[PDB]
């Protein structure tokens, strides 16, 4: 490749931690989901 220029733009594993961080936020949404369910109960 001639890639010596700046191609660098993309995020897959790069922003994975962002997106996956969101995913862990979601599973957390399960835990505190049932939690706050109990809280309201």
């Amino acid at each position: 490749d001639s890639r010596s220029n700046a191609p660098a733009t993309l995020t897959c594993e790069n922003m994975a931690g962002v997106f996956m961080l969101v995913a862990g936020g979601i599973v957390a949404g399960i835990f505190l989901i049932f939690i706050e369910i109990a809280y309201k109960r």
Partner: protein
Amino acid sequence: FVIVESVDPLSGTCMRNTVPCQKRYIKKCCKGFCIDILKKISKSVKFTYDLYLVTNGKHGKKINGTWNGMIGEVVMKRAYMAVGSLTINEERSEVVDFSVPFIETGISVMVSRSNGTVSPSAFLEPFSACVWVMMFVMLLIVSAVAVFVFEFTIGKAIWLLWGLVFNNSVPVQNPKGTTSKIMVSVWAFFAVIFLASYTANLAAFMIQEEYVDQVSGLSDKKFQRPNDFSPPFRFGTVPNGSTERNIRNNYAEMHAYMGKFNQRGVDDALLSLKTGKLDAFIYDAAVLNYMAGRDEGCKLVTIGSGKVFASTGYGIAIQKDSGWKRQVDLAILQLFGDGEMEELEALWLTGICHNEKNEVMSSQLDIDNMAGVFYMLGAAMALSLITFI
């Protein structure tokens, strides 16, 4: 490669390094690159410099067998050694003695810099769609929370959360679950990131970009089916071109369109490109890099990445078995042995056109490349009609 001048009448004679070259036989004023080359050459070479303007032609040819030019001169032997920039050539070799290249050369045609640039339209392409797939997974898990907090409707409501996901602006009826709203935060700050991210890689691909977007060349068959296009793409040089005959060896369709490819004058033709009177022009290749360096305005970009056809060069050839032959060969030896030949680029070759990045012309009203996105859209319309039926 060479500079003609007229001595100042107030002067009537040369100054600086100007060396006389007559024109018939009233003297003319002499200068230029190879002029300087041989200048430094004869220094240690110890051969007293004598030169003039060529009478006719440039280099030479076989008319019947006859050379109309400097080849015609050493054929006539009207000179001891070769003045003028050699076209490194096999037939030239067949003629008589030749030199080692002072400046390497090649075979090429020279474009202007295309206003028609701006490249593949990475628009969607930067997306890193493996991650974007992970976002499809995010749609799934979104639904997972949907049915989750529960224990069309929630189903299409997912498509709403996908509305958030895509540019937000989803009109439809958010669900009233509080934890659901927390998920809305998930996809919310999420696609915020994703949003400005697509922005990022986007205007990145704008900023950081590879312009290029030009024709490969006679190495390419599009150049080999030019009449097959609506306009022809003018490619070539003027008559009696040395490398042109190299095309007479090389490409048939070259010789074919050559009539249309007929052109008058080198820098003249350069002006023709400046007027767009032609697509592009073959010419003395390495020169074409250089006089490419010479620019009326700074616009054009000579065709080719710099990888050129048919490597070549220039030197002082001679009649076969000349006297100085191997010596002057050594003159080449120590000659390049200078390293001041860098300064030969200076006094001549080093250009003001600079080089390398032309990068961003791509500021545009953005047709075409935008219409690709339009294509992805219409495609969605197609899949839509499919499922509709």
